[PDB]
């Protein structure tokens, strides 16, 4: 019976691959060949955010495109005023081994997590005038790798225990659990409509989940190494993911297959972060070679480079209005680019 089930699984995989091949008739590069190139893009460091005492692991822009939160290995969460470089808040953490942070869309809360396997919610608007932890979400058996707010009461987290979880912050319990990844889940991206979200794990696969139903809508497998980053296209019908194989890849939800690959022979370092510009024309990826590469998402051409960091670029972020780009690195510095 087990052999029959394995044969059925192999046949289903073959049929899915055949359907994907049948739906593939013309490549994105061929379709976008006639389009004029973006041209060389030269962004400059508009601001340098200093004050962290160790490597920066994560950053998240606020929805106002002016406030951002950063997570660093010195057990500190810092909220910055990007316009004036001013430090709004400096939140000490109980566990210093943070690996992710998030900003609530309302701006009332920030999220934290790491090797403690706990997603901590911090309240920013308290009558006492200080930031205090509001909720400690426990239930993951592995480390927390990513977290993103759906609203003030809902948050989605990814863990090293090969699962993703949707939490009700008020009760503190997992409303939904997302299983199916066979490796450590590394990154997650929320759709603009919030109905769906996409996840990337160490099994070299990307999975699209439905938040309400709670099951895996689709699985994407084109990478040959661990997926470290994942981001949605601005319209929500596609997503990009960067892996340890020195390659970024773009997948289409409706086509259910890879559309484009962003790689160079001179690039051998893995990708730490990926992000799209406001129109989706530019795909910005962070690398271990200390630099950020700006890709033409439609032509797979390297349109620019952000080279201002003395160590590995760990996190990336484009504002909601698309005006700026924040880059965090292991040299304990955050840079705003334009």
């Amino acid at each position: 019976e087990l052999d029959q089930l394995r044969q059925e699984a192999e046949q289903l995989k073959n049929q899915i691959r055949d359907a994907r091949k049948a739906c593939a008739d013309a490549t994105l590069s061929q379709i976008t060949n006639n389009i004029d190139p973006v041209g060389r893009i030269q962004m400059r460091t508009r601001r340098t955010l200093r004050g962290h005492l160790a490597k920066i692991y994560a950053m998240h822009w606020g929805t106002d495109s002016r406030l951002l939160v950063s997570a660093s290995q010195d057990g500190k969460l810092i909220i910055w005023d990007s316009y004036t470089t001013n430090k709004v808040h400096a939140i000490p953490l109980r566990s210093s081994w943070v690996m992710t942070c998030a900003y609530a869309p309302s701006g009332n809360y920030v999220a934290c997590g790491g090797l403690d396997n706990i997603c901590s919610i911090y309240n920013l608007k308290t009558r006492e005038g200080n930031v205090r932890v509001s909720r400690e979400l426990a239930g993951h058996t592995g480390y927390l790798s990513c977290c993103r707010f759906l609203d003030d009461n809902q948050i989605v987290t990814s863990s090293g225990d090969t699962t993703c979880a949707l939490w009700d912050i008020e009760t503190g319990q997992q409303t939904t659990t997302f299983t199916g990844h066979t490796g450590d889940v590394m990154s997650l991206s929320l759709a603009p409509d919030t109905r769906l979200f996409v996840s990337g794990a160490c099994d070299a696969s990307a999975k699209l989940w439905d938040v309400r139903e709670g099951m895996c809508r689709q699985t994407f497998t084109g990478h040959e190494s661990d997926i470290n980053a994942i981001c949605f296209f601005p319209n929500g019908n596609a997503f990009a993911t960067g892996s340890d194989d020195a390659t970024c890849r773009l997948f289409d939800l409706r086509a259910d297959q890879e559309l484009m690959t962003y790689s160079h022979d001179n690039i051998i370092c893995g990708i730490t972060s990926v992000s799209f510009s406001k129109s989706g024309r530019l795909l910005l990826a962070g690398y271990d070679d200390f630099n950020c590469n700006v890709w033409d998402a439609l032509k797979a051409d390297r349109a620019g480079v952000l080279a201002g960091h003395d160590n590995r670029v760990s996190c990336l972020g484009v504002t909601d209005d698309g005006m700026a780009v924040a880059t965090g690195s292991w040299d304990s510095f955050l840079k705003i680019w334009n």
């Binding site: 359907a19 739906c23 994105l28 962004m43 596609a238 559309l259 129109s279």
Partner: peptide
Amino acid sequence: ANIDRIKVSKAAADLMAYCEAHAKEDPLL
């Protein structure tokens, strides 16, 4: 396997249309 998949050309055209429509509103581009 039960999902319905559109052609790759349609997806590429839709992505191009979205990029072209919002090109003027992208400060970075």
